[PDB]
Chain A
């Protein structure tokens, strides 16, 4: 009768009190999705079914997901990650001669497929062009020419706004050619809703966390600026 009616309303209040407390933690954390081209060395970056990590920087909580338990070529589960802050894409830039179409073509095709997705139409991508020293050594040495596998490398010139830093004139051209090859796909498809952030990464460096922090800050700032019709 009325004895049980008040009993249920007591348990509802306890549950609703817990949900309010847990809502604060959910809204104050940022989720990231980590991808890869298959042999890009994305586990070394993390070290330096599904695997998740927790870390915070400047008292801001972050949460990363790695999907190695699903080896399917098609990605039916990619629609679940439509509310993440950003996607981290790791590619080995020193694999232009490995047939494994070479690996760079497969990575570019995967990037194009991910960028032109119905569900992922408002998510930015943080791009890590890994294995820089292998690429530098292979370019400096002979017996391997990029124009053999990518004919457009011939007649291509280094852009004026380049920051080679005490480098060979050659190595510098190859890096910017690959970065522009990715940016060409990045720019055309989308217009203002999501951008791409390319970086040159190796195994020795340890500044990647700061880079992720900075691109996340820029992503949120641009989101708010576009929402307020100021951009």
Chain B
């Protein structure tokens, strides 16, 4: 009946992909010279948080950044001179995410209270509270000065209107908790990796799912667009990373090693898209090669689990945070 009808389409989808596999990415990029050896050293260390850190977002100016911690603070730093600029106290001590507006006027926050809060930096006080989700917030990203996309643990995502606090549209289709999301460079599509080991490509204007990828074997923790915008990468807690192509609609390469068994908490790309930086549970960060899947560096300056990772817009520095309440700038 209906159940058997869905099975027939699944075979048709799989068959169509198999006809387009002319070759593999590893074969094509065999003749290009390797990147070599990459070594990075800590330039700055930021102190002041009383507890572990989960969130961190760079500024558009590539100089200011924000961070969140369970002690209930939202501190804005100055990476150049190492000077604290702001310190916003939160009503709820369980914060799981944070974001920084493209214009630098607002900062968002959220966590186990099922609410997203917006703060007015240039006025600091709470400006808006958004409610309606039935699960803990996992991520939030600013579309523009008046729109924001959030994902929660009720297996749904939504798009908000800060002026009136109403869900413009709702995205459904996942069967597990949504763990992360990332916006396209042009801000028309975004992807979300959930706990059902699947990632979907949504349309902001229309509000419908377009493509689905089901490569991983366990919970998906991180996701990030390629700088071009035609690909993305994910990281699960089975110590594997995969690169998916939207146009070919299939996985291209896998990044794994035989000496790693810990989970992956965060991923990010480089300015040119050649390097792939991923954070792990073994207290250190690894640097991969996107075109060859070969390790090229290790960042081993942290004494606890690494929870967040980010690269500046100009590609000048990499910031990492960990559970020992310290941030570090690597260059």
Is A15 within 8 A of B113, CB to CB? Answer: no
A161 within 8 A of B: no
| Bound complex: CA A19 to CA B113 (Å) | 24
Whole-angstrom distance between the Cβ of A50 and the nearest chain B Cβ: 5
A8 x B136 contact (CB < 8 A): no
Number of A-B contacts (CB under 8 A): 65
- Chain A residues numbered 92-150 whose CB sits less than 8 Å from any CB in chain B: none
Q: What 1/0 flags go to A53-91 for Cβ under 8 Å of B?
A: 000000000000001011010101100100100000000
How far, in angstroms, from A85 to B229 measured CA to CA in the complex? 46
CA gap between A12 and B70 in the complex, in Å:
21
Given contacts A19-B48, A76-B177, A76-B195, contact A69 B84 (CB under 8 A): no
A72/B78 in contact, CB under 8 A:
no
Contact B87 A19 (CB under 8 A): yes
Are A76 and B153 touching (Cβ within 8 A)?
yes
Contact of B83 among A8, A23, A67, A70 (CB under 8 A): A8
User: Once the chains are docked, how many angstroms separate the CA of A11 from the CA of B96?
Assistant: 27
Which residue of B has the minimal Cβ distance to A63? B93
Chain B window 40-83, contacts with chain A (Cβ cutoff 8 Å), 1 for yes, 0 for no:
00000000101110000000000000000011000000100101
Which secondary structure dominates where chain A touches chain B?
A: helix
Inter-chain contact B92/A11, CB cutoff 8 Å: no
| A220-B199 Cα distance, complex, nearest whole Å | 45
Within 8 A of A (CB), among B134-185: 134-136, 153, 177
CB distance from B132 to the nearest CB of A (A): 12
By beta carbon, the residue of chain B nearest A19 is B48
**Across the interface, do B87 and A49 meet the contact criterion of CB distance under 8 Å?**
no
Cα A83 to Cα B304 in complex, Å, equals: 14
| Chain A residues numbered 1-31 whose CB sits less than 8 Å from any CB in chain B | 8-9, 11-12, 15-16, 18-19, 22-23, 26
How many residues does chain A have at the interface if contact means C-beta atoms less than 8 Å apart? 22
Expressed in whole angstroms, the Cα–Cα distance for A112 and B137 within the complex equals 28
CB distance from A176 to the nearest CB of B (A): 38
Give the distance in Å from the alpha carbon of A47 to the alpha carbon of B195 in the complex.
36
CB neighbours (8 Å) of B86 from chain A are: 15
The smallest C-beta distance from B178 to any residue of chain A, in angstroms, reads 11
CB of B115 within 8 A of chain A?
yes
- B153 contacts A11, CB within 8 Å? no
Contacts of A18 in B (CB 8 A): 87
When the two chains form the complex, which single residue of A11, A19, A77 contacts B112, counting CB atoms closer than 8 Å? A77
Q: B94: CB under 8 A from chain A?
A: yes
CB-CB under 8 A from A49, the residues of chain B are 92, 112-115, 136
Please measure, in the bound complex, the distance between the C-alpha atom of A12 and the C-alpha atom of B135, giving whole angstroms: 37
* A50 and B78 contact, CB distance less than 8 A: no
Q: How far is it, in angstroms, between the C-alpha of A47 and the C-alpha of B153 when the chains are bound?
A: 29
At the interface, yes or no: B21 with Cβ under 8 Å from chain A?
no
Asked if B85 is at the interface of the complex by the 8 Å CB criterion, the answer is yes
Minimum C-beta distance from A34 to chain B (A): 14
- Which of B48, B85, B115, B135 contacts A70 (CB under 8 A)? B135
A11 touches B85 (CB 8 A): yes
Q: Is the CB of A15 within 8 A of B112?
A: no
With A49-B112, A76-B195 already in contact, the answer to whether A15 and B84 are too (CB < 8 A) is yes
- Report whether B114 and A69 are in contact in the complex, using a CB–CB cutoff of 8 Å: yes
Bound form: Cα–Cα A80–B219 in Å: 17
CB distance from B197 to the nearest CB of A (A): 13
A70 touches B136 (CB 8 A): yes
B78, chain A: closest CB distance, angstroms: 7
Q: Is the CB of A72 within 8 A of B153?
A: yes
Q: Is the CB of B87 within 8 A of A11?
A: no
Residues of B within 8 A of A12 (CB): 83-84
The distance from the CB of A199 to the nearest CB of chain B, in whole angstroms, is 28
- Distance, CA A77 to CA B83, complexed state (A): 33
Which of A50, A69, A77, A80 meets B70, CB within 8 Å? A80
Q: Give complex CA distance A11, B85 in Å.
A: 7
A50 touches B153 (CB 8 A): no
Which chain B positions have C-beta within 8 A of A15?
A: 48, 84, 86-87
Residues of A within 8 A of B135 (CB): 69-70, 72
Closest to A72 in B: B153
User: What B residues does A69 contact at CB under 8 A?
Assistant: 112-114, 134-136
Q: CB-CB contacts of B305-321 with A at 8 A, as 1s and 0s?
A: 00000000000000000
A8 and B81 contact, CB distance less than 8 A? yes
Contacts A/B (CB < 8 Å), 28 sampled: A8-B81, A8-B83, A9-B83, A11-B83, A11-B84, A11-B85, A12-B83, A12-B84, A15-B86, A16-B48, A18-B87, A19-B87, A22-B50, A23-B50, A26-B71, A49-B112, A49-B113, A49-B114, A50-B112, A69-B113, A69-B134, A70-B135, A70-B136, A72-B135, A76-B177, A77-B136, A80-B112, A83-B52
6 cross-chain pairs, A with B, having the tightest CB-CB distances, nearest first:
A49-B113, A49-B114, A15-B84, A12-B83, A8-B83, A12-B84
Q: Could you list 4 further interchain pairs (A-B, Cβ under 8 angstroms) beyond the known A19-B87, A50-B113, A80-B96?
A: A26-B71, A69-B112, A70-B135, A76-B195
